[PDB]
Design a protein around this ligand. Structure first.
Ligand SMILES: Nc1ncnc2c1ncn2[C@H]1CC[C@@H](COP(=O)(O)OP(=O)(O)OP(=O)(O)O)O1
Ligand code: SF4
Lengths: 1140, 261, 258, 259
DNA sequence: GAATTGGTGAGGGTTGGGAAGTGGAAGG
DNA sequence: CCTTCCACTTCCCAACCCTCACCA
């Protein structure tokens, strides 16, 4: 035992010396100072008895560059529940049993959300156990936690222990939840001397932050041709980095053929990028120099891109080969999770932000693409195979590349990441390491824990997973789910405001709207704008022009007009619906728990009922057939855990194994006995939401929402400043205000992601507050609002696309559009309203808006106010210049979630779902789609529009029919490549056949498992012809062979094409040109021809036939011999209907 | 009750197997005088009528006139169980919930029985002009069946021309053209192996072959078919059973705009 | 070395395909007294028992107990190549991993020689215990095939009842119930046209009809089939190939909820 | 003008039924000598050759030798109309865009008359090579077809061996391997069971079973099939039509040297 | 230990049932 | 001795399951 304690002491000393070497002096002398809390860790310390106890080391920094540490002791604790009245006996038994293992035990009353009748004010006495160090907590919990199972299954003092809580929450996150210590704030610290706990307390007024010294670094290495590097054999060429605006480079003359010289790099005037250069004679000298320079500059923030994947496993190996222990010199060691972390500094990987927070597609998750998207300039490229020659022939260009990578890494960290991460850390207890690395669900669990502790509510334990539960009818459920977002694609083709388009309309709709114009506008002004209707001056004037334009519509519904393209969508929809109905994961109640509640009084308005659609799939097997399978498994035997071991009887296996064995064994029987393997059932259900239950979750969502609205409000204010400065032409003001615009927009997008996480969190496996119903009720309530908006807009006009948030539509040119209401109050002298907004919004006012909101008036009174609330409001984009939708190649189907929209400014506004955005889909499809969307803007008539659009596609068909005879010899190897990537290790897919697996095996046969060895393999291939009639997946050729050695290419291609008789092993012979022609044929059809024949124009492309079904229906339109019905020839004697 | 028996289920089998493919569900009208069916496509292009005289059954009773609705594919399942020589019995009761069927082997080695389930239906009823037709042709049923199948491969629609010289079927598609011609059989072994045309005046008509292909499914009910036509009005084609009565298919021709123009 | 020669070579084709769909693969057992198998389908509702006596073969040699894993799909594709008129020879070695088959045409023009790879199979096997089946029946095979095929359209499980008068099949389903009765016929011209029933006490039980459409594939083995019933005991179907062997299917009843 | 008349539909039907798998669109050539066609298959693996002499028709008018482009699947879907007994006549004018086809019931009770669009086709072709052969084998067609199908079940390709005593086939693959011999017949009673071999030198050669299993589709065309074989030169498989004509396929051997 | 959700498109391979054609056996 | 019906095998199209990445 003692040796382990001494090893923990040894590592604690090692870390204390490591950070002391980096300048973090511990506070030794009694006194008082101020500082900004940048980091912390938990560590043990020795008390006045020299007993080891657990503590947290806070790290502080100051504006003068001084730094220090403070250690604060805090006893870990958790709760146990005891049967009625046992708590004194249980605590006495535990305290004698575990004397010296436990620190203190005590009884505490806590409220618990699951307690019956709890809103009376009831609470129950949990017992806290607290320990001198977490190792005794871990031991005592491993003693206790098996013993409580029997109490659960049935229903010594240990029998009285019923349950235990919070025994798995992190220790350090306790302290920052409990004592409100939070990161990125200025604190006083007062140390009385060792006899007393330190005092730490925030000071709010020092709003400005200090500037911690930041380093970012990257490396370049040798590698084998055509293959991945290996850290044993390859060697670093150069390491490039930046500290606080100063750049540096180190280069190794063992490999780099010439000395580099210092230079400066600035793509945009903001990125000053001065780079210093040092030339070092050998790899060991390079590494030692870098280590010394880091130990000199002693950064607190250390920055990499993907650096846990490539850079650290490389530099650690190259250091250790020369005996330089990076772990001892720097401090970095690979954690158990495989992530390099350090005691003295914070480690931040930008990719783990880009992946989680950017809202970019995987197509742009590469550093170069994320830089291009966010920073607004093109980085420089080197071909990964040529760096071996570049380091020999042109060292300066390799240095320039590595510097460009350093500059991009640093400035991308600085602009987006630095504000956001610490801003979020102001409200999450966690370190900047966890808050960046942790999953977006755990963050939200922490934000909820903060409030739940402040409410003094004991947490529930994590939800425990279930396997093969039964439907009530007994069918074994494979899957349960709720029906999600609702999507429709009502129309097809093109729309433009520039061209005449036909409408038909219902006059009763106009009469209904005209009859309510004032009642709509009053609500639109007072509730949404918050300008009282008494303060507006000319309210009566505009109402008459509205009424008269509605009358002008009412008199003539059917018409030709220009269309107004409008998008009409709900803001912050699912948060707002949660707030409006006041949904909470705890608040769903059955009838029996309401019957247990003293507020269950006849006529009490507390119960709200809402409906949702459940979906579940069950296997067809009977309950009794499943019991038969189980009865047969009463004697089955199974293989050992390991080849040496004896075989295991079925009763020895884990539940996780047994459930999977049952599921397979029953699925086979089902395949035999009941031909449909799975039955899918949809069912509507209703669930009651309590309205008086504690609001902590919903108030959390309210606060987070209002924070995101803070960022959007500043975004709107600076948008005002920007638009003024742009109209005036104030370049310095435009530059500053545009920087503020970017900063607040990216912040509000990140908050959008985290805020939305609050909804889906409720479904996460294991979540503490878990419930499926609150995830369905929101989806269904979001499907209603959009469906009713489709009803209304379909009466006035023609909706064109739906999704979960809002409608895309065309409206007739005569519609009221926009108005300005003038005001006496100079604070808001002009209020602008769009009528389509209030037109939709009033239906949400009338139907949806909540009329059962309740709030506690006085905790001692047990009395509540009743209130009404709505926050669901439509808002309006555009109007837009043009819209295009594709249509399905199959009859009766329409392509959802694929479309393109253009701003009145005349440039691409949105382009959603098409292959251009997808990662690595066939490049030719990308280039064709890109060109045709821009081509749709040309022309002025549908005959012109489709006649021009056809000319873009026809050129690419002419390319394919010409076998690209004019295309440069290298270009096909890119243009024709698929780049389909593969997630898992090639072992794990088993037998399943697909072209990715096929070509990964085809490479493994060429270069061995050194490529296969690890997850995330990438593939590039073409599909060949010559093994005729072989199924498609068996003609795949990876591009690699066209760069392999000729005598090996003419071996592997001879094998794979089953032919030496192929006289020329040339891609142009090898390509399956007709397959690529069919691929493009489909890509042209879905956009340029089927969406033509639906718009009553002819087929605009000769080369591509319609599908024969459409050819038949279109030709049947076009002949004189009309098919009569028999009802036109024979007299109808009557209608008759038959009853059984 | 209703109750009937039939000498050979082959007739009723070929009936159901000719109805099932065209009309999905239909209702029978039932009486002491027999059984009748009239029903129309959900396409409303074409129409079907069947008459089964009581005197054709082996034994027949009905207590009171009734009607009942049946899904024809569901019934047509069960009759697949009846053997070619089996003797079949049908029953129903005035509560009209179910149709009982029983099959007996000729040697009474075996009994098979089933309880088919009725359904509720709506229909619109069409009067028949009962005119005489300006042309009638009577023809070997299999030869008309093959004429239909062959031309259905040539194109989507047939043109029918009837003249004193004979009858011609024609069609075309993007492949080209096809013609089939018949003329009066001068020397007749028996009328069941002869084509005969009778006319008032010549006629020309056009029809969509997809329906004719479903009409020809009745071929195994008789050696010969009759077709009756008059200008600008529905074509009627008929198969008849010597015992039971008749099955008639009615189709409305296509017509030109120039009439309306 | 095991070797044997069978003059009525079609039997191997028939008896193999009567299992091709029911069991994928099995370890065929060979001894001086014949070629044998017991096996179970992976659904574990049913057991298969097969034996061909060496006395029936035109030639037979066996010098040790031999076991050989075969996937029946492969031999099924091989036995597609033999005509029903051909004479079959089978050969195996205790020191090799391949089975050899030779086909000989009665005209002596045509011969064939197929080699297929054995596979490495072992299975833990119980002998089916002796049973006093309280009721036993013999029927012409095509009649039982038609009964099960026709009832399969009405539904997926059949209730069979036996009584002093004979047997009844009955079924229920969404399209409505139905029944078939076979009484004990009085007199018959030949056994291939005859039904025979013995019943010690009345029994009725429910059987999963979707399985019997597998067993009925044995029909070309025999003009007649033997069946047996008892309470809470797998029903027997038995085919016998002249006097030279047997194939039997044992199938459990559906365990009712009550 | 061109026309010709024939009492049999069966030959013209089953020729189309044999071609439809190998060739989609073809140019026929037409002469006083009859109808001829040679054409590479769509995969260019093998070459079809066919002719029907004019002596085989009931009557034949051809004022000038000519060539005509036609679509095989369409002509098949027309010829499926004729009954096997029906009298066939084919005709075209010297400048028609169309081929006209007439089918009559033997009793003349019925007439049927169809038209197909011509198309403009030309194809680049060699004068077909022929030689004396190392081996020639005569077999009943149905047995050769069945053997080829059974070998295709076991594997991808068949290797053939010829010798004085008999003809042997072998194949190998993931199922194992299979070997077959047909003996020379001891005394031919009539050719409809006769296997006979001409043997200048023993030969062994390998071919892909897919294309043989397409060539076999002509099996209804004649009860006897003939194989013509030598090393380092195409196999030819030949069927003969009445006396009037012949159908042949040319295929190269799957080179074993690659192994 | 650590872990937000459901709906959709595109591509490629596998599985079931119905329709067509041929050969064998029974009926007259 | 010839024609029709039953049974078996082959061929063709629709539906269902696997992956990955985007739209919310
Ligand atoms: N990451 C996510 N996780 C779960 N559901 C999500 C989601 N993103 C969207 N949804 C679902 C639920 C919400 C819905 C999309 O609406 P928003 O509230 O995201 O608002 P929007 O219009 O995108 O932006 P705003 O107007 O607030 O600025 O889709
Ligand atoms: S909804 Fe009303 S009755 Fe039900 S638990 Fe809540 S307060 Fe009690």
């Amino acid at each position: 035992s003692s040796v382990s304690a001494l090893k923990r002491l040894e590592r604690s000393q090692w870390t204390d010396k490591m950070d002391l070497r980096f300048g973090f002096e511990r506070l030794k002398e009694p006194g008082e100072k101020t500082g900004w809390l940048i980091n912390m860790h938990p560590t043990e310390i020795l008390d006045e008895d020299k007993r080891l106890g657990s503590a947290v080391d806070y790290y502080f920094i100051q504006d003068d560059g001084s730094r220090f540490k403070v250690a604060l002791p805090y006893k870990p604790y958790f709760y146990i529940a005891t049967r009625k009245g046992c708590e004194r006996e249980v605590s006495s038994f535990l305290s004698k049993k575990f004397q010296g293992k436990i620190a203190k035990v005590e009884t505490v009353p806590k409220e618990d959300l699951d307690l019956p009748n709890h809103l009376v004010g009831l609470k129950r006495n949990y017992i806290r156990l607290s320990f001198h160090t977490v190792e005794d907590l871990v031991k005592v919990r491993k003693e206790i936690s098996p013993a409580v199972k029997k109490n659960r299954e049935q229903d010594d003092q240990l029998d009285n222990i019923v349950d235990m809580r919070e025994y798995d929450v992190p220790y350090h996150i306790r302290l920052s939840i409990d004592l409100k210590i939070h990161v990125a704030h200025w604190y006083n610290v007062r140390y009385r001397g060792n006899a007393f706990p330190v005092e730490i307390t925030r000071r709010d007024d020092l709003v400005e932050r200090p500037d911690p010294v930041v380093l970012a670094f990257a490396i370049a290495t040798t590698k084998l041709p055509l293959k991945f590097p290996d850290a044993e054999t390859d060697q670093i060429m150069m390491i490039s980095y930046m500290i606080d605006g100063q750049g540096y480079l180190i280069t190794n003359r063992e490999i780099v053929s010439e000395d580099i010289e210092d230079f400066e790099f600035t793509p945009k005037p903001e990125y000053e990028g001065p780079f210093c250069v040092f030339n070092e004679p050998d790899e060991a000298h390079l590494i030692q120099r870098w280590f010394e320079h880091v130990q000199e500059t002693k950064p607190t923030i250390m920055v990499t891109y993907n650096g846990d994947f490539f850079d650290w496993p490389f530099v650690e190996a190259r250091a250790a080969v020369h005996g330089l222990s990076m772990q001892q010199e720097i401090g970095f060691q690979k954690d158990s999770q495989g992530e390099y972390k350090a005691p003295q500094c914070i480690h931040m990987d930008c990719l783990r932000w880009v992946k989680r927070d950017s809202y970019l597609p995987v197509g742009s998750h590469n550093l170069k693409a994320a830089a291009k998207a966010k920073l607004g300039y093109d980085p420089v490229e080197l071909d990964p195979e040529d760096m071996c020659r570049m380091a020999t022939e042109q060292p300066q260009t390799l240095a320039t590349y590595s510097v460009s990578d350093a500059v991009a890494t640093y400035y991308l960290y600085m602009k987006y990441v630095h504000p956001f991460i610490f801003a979020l850390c102001t409200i999450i207890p966690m370190e900047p390491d966890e808050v960046l690395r942790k999953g977006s669900g755990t963050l939200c669990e922490a934000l909820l824990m903060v409030q739940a502790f402040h409410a003094n509510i004991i947490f529930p334990n994590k939800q425990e997973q279930e396997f093969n539960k039964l439907t009530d009818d007994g069918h074994v459920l494979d899957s349960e789910t709720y029906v999600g977002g609702h999507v429709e694609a009502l129309e097809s083709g093109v729309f433009r405001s520039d061209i005449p388009c036909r409408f038909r309309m219902n006059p009763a709709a106009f009469d209904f709207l005209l009859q309510r114009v004032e009642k709509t506008l009053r609500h639109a002004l007072e509730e949404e704008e918050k300008v009282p209707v008494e303060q507006v001056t000319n309210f009566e004037e505009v109402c008459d022009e509205i009424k008269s334009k509605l009358a002008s519509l009412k008199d003539v519904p059917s018409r030709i007009e220009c269309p107004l393209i409008y998008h009409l969508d709900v803001g912050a929809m699912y948060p707002n619906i949660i707030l409006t109905n006041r949904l909470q994961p705890s608040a769903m109640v059955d009838e029996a728990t309401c019957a247990a509640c003293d507020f269950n009084k006849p006529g009490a308005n507390c119960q709200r009922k809402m409906a949702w659609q459940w979906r579940g799939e069950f296997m067809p097997a009977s309950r009794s057939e499943y019991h038969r399978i189980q009865h047969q498994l009463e004697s089955e035997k199974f293989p050992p855990l390991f080849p040496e071991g004896p075989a295991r009887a079925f009763h020895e296996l884990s539940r996780e194994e047994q459930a999977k064995y049952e599921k397979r064994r029953l699925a086979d029987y089902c395949r035999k006995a009941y031909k449909k393997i799975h039955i899918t059932k949809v069912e509507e259900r209703l669930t009651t939401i309590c309205q008086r239950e504690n609001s902590f979750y919903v108030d959390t969502v309210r606060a987070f929402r209002d924070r995101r609205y803070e960022f959007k409000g500043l975004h709107k204010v600076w948008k005002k400043k920007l638009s003024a400065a742009v109209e005036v032409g104030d370049a310095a003001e435009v530059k500053r205000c545009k920087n503020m615009e970017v900063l607040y927009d990216s912040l509000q997008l990140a908050h959008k992601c985290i805020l939305n996480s609050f909804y889906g969190y409720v479904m996460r496996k294991g979540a503490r507050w878990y419930s499926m119903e609150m995830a369905g009720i929101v989806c269904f309530t979001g499907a209603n609002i959009i469906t009713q908006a489709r009803e209304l807009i379909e009466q006035i006009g023609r909706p064109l696309e739906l999704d979960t948030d809002g409608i895309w539509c065309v409206l007739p040119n005569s519609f009221p559009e926009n108005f300005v209401f003038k005001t006496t109050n100079v604070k808001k002298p002009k209020v602008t309203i769009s009528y389509p907004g209030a037109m939709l919004n009033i239906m949400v006012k009338e139907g949806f808006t909540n009329d059962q909101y309740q709030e506690l008036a006085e905790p001692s009174s047990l009395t509540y106010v009743t209130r009404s609330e709505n926050s669901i409001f439509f808002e309006v984009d555009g109007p837009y210049l043009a819209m295009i939708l594709p249509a399905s190649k199959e009859e009766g189907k329409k392509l959802k979630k694929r479309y393109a929209v253009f701003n009145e400014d005349g440039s691409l506004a949105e382009l959603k779902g098409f292959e251009v955005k997808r990662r690595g889909e066939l490049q030719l499809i990308k280039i064709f789609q890109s060109s045709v969307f821009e081509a749709f803007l040309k022309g002025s008539t549908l005959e012109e529009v489709y006649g021009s659009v056809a000319k873009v596609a026809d050129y690419w068909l002419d390319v394919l029919y010409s076998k690209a005879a004019n295309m440069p010899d290298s270009e096909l190897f890119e243009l024709i490549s698929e780049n389909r990537s593969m997630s898992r290790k090639l072992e794990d897919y088993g037998e399943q056949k697909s072209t990715s697996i096929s070509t990964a095996k085809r490479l493994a046969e060429f270069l061995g498992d050194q490529m296969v060895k690890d997850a995330g393999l990438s593939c590039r291939y073409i599909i060949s012809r010559k093994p005729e009639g072989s199924p498609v997946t068996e003609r795949a050729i990876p591009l690699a062979i066209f760069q392999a050695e000729p005598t090996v290419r003419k071996h592997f291609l001879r094998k794979w094409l089953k032919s030496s008789s192929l006289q020329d092993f040339d891609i142009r012979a090898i390509l399956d040109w007709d397959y690529y022609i069919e691929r493009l044929g489909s890509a042209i059809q879905k956009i340029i021809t089927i969406p033509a024949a639906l718009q009553q124009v002819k087929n605009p492309v000769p080369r591509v036939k319609h599908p024969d079904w459409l050819h038949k229906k279109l030709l049947e339109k076009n002949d004189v011999y009309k098919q009569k019905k028999i009802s036109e020839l024979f007299t109808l004697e009557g209608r008759r209907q038959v009853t059984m | 009750m209703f109750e009937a028996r039939l000498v050979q289920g082959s007739i009723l089998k070929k009936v159901l197997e000719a109805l099932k493919d065209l009309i999905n569900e239909a209702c029978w009208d039932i009486s002491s005088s027999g059984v009748n069916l009239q029903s129309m496509d959900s396409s409303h292009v074409s129409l079907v009528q069947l008459t089964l005289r009581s005197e054709g059954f082996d034994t027949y009773r009905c207590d009171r006139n009734l009607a009942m609705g049946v899904n024809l594919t569901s019934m047509s399942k069960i009759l697949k169980c009846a053997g070619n020589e089996d003797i079949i019995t049908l029953r129903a009761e005035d509560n009209a919930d179910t149709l009982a069927l029983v099959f007996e082997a000729p040697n009474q080695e075996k009994v098979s029985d089933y309880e088919m389930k009725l359904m509720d239906l709506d229909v619109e009823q069409l009067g028949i002009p009962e005119q005489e037709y300006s042309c009638v042709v009577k023809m070997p049923s299999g030869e008309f069946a093959r004429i239909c199948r062959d031309l259905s491969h040539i194109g989507d629609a047939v043109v029918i021309s009837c003249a004193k010289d004979g009858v011609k079927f024609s069609a075309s598609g993007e492949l080209g053209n096809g013609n089939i011609k018949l003329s009066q059989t001068s020397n007749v072994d028996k009328e069941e192996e002869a084509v005969t045309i009778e006319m008032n005046e010549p006629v020309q008509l056009t029809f969509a072959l997809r329906y004719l292909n479903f009409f020809t499914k009745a071929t195994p009910l008789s050696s010969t078919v009759t077709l009756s036509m008059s200008a600008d009005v529905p074509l009627v084609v008929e198969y008849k059973i010597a015992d039971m009565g008749h099955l008639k298919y009615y189709l409305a021709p296509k017509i030109e705009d120039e009439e309306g123009s």
